[PDB]
Amino acid sequence: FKPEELRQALMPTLEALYRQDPESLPFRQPVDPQLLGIPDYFDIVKSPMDLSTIKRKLDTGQYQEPWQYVDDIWLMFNNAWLYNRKTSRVYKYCSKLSEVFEQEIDPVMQSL
Ligand SMILES: CO[C@H]1CC[C@H](n2c([C@@H]3CCCC(=O)N3c3ccc(F)c(F)c3)nc3cc(-c4c(C)noc4C)ccc32)CC1
Ligand code: NI
Ligand code: NI
Ligand code: NI
Ligand code: NI
Ligand code: NI
Ligand code: NI
C-alpha cells in the first residue's frame, strides 16, 4: 500500500462523513469534557477518536493499510455509542454516520 494512493482511496469516505450535517457536527473535533462539563468522559472513553484526528492521521500517512483506518472510524463511533444514551441525539447521529460509513467503505475495501 503506497500511502498517497491509500489516502486517495480512503479520504472520500472521510469526506462523506464530514458532509453529514448536522450528524457529523459532534464528531468534527475531539470531545471536550471541560467545555461540555462531563468530567467522567475520559474515565469511560479510554481511547478518544474524532474526525479531525482521523483526518490528520490520514494526511500524515499514519495508516499503512485500510483496516487501521476502519479501526479508528469504528473507535470513534463506538466511543459515542458507549458514552451516550440510545435516546440521545448524539447516539442517533452516530448511527447515521456509521450507516453512511458502511455504504461508503464497502466498495472501497473491495477495490483495494
Ligand atoms: C460546536 O459544535 C457543537 C458543540 C456542542 C456539541 N455537543 C452537544 C450539544 C450539547 C447539548 C445539547 C445538544 O443537543 N448538543 C448537540 C449539538 C449538535 C449535535 F449535532 C448534537 F448531536 C448534539 N452534545 C455533545 C456530545 C458529544 C459527545 C460525543 C460525540 N461523545 O460523547 C459526547 C458527550 C460531543 C459534542 C456535543 C455538538 C456540536
Ligand atoms: Ni475529495
Ligand atoms: Ni444528514
Ligand atoms: Ni509504510
Ligand atoms: Ni481499535
Ligand atoms: Ni458515495
Ligand atoms: Ni460491510
Author numbering: 1049 to 1160
Provide the authors' original text about this structure.
As expected, CCS1477 binds through canonical hydrogen-bonding interactions of its dimethyl isoxazole moiety with a conserved asparagine residue in the acetyl-lysine (Kac) binding site (CBPN1168, EP300N1132, BRD4N140). In EP300/CBP, an analogous tryptophan residue is not present, and instead the equivalent LPF shelf is less bulky and facilitates interaction with CCS1477. Superposition of CCS1477 as bound in the respective Kac sites reveals an altered binding pose, reflecting the reduced shape complementarity between CCS1477 and BRD4, as compared with EP300/CBP. Further analysis of the binding energies by isothermal titration calorimetry (ITC) confirmed significantly stronger interaction of CCS1477 with the bromodomains of CBP and EP300 (Kd = 4.0 and 26 nM, respectively) than with BD1 of BRD4 (Kd = 403 nM). Thus, the difluorophenyl group is a critical moiety in the CCS1477 pharmacophore that facilitates potent interaction with the bromodomain of EP300/CBP and is required for efficacy in cell line models of G3MB.
These proteins contain several highly homologous domains, including KIX, bromodomains (BRDs) and HAT domains, through which they interact with, dock to, and acetylate target proteins, respectively. EP300/CBP are critical gene-regulatory targets in cancer, with existing high potency inhibitors of either the catalytic HAT domain or protein-binding bromodomain (BRD).
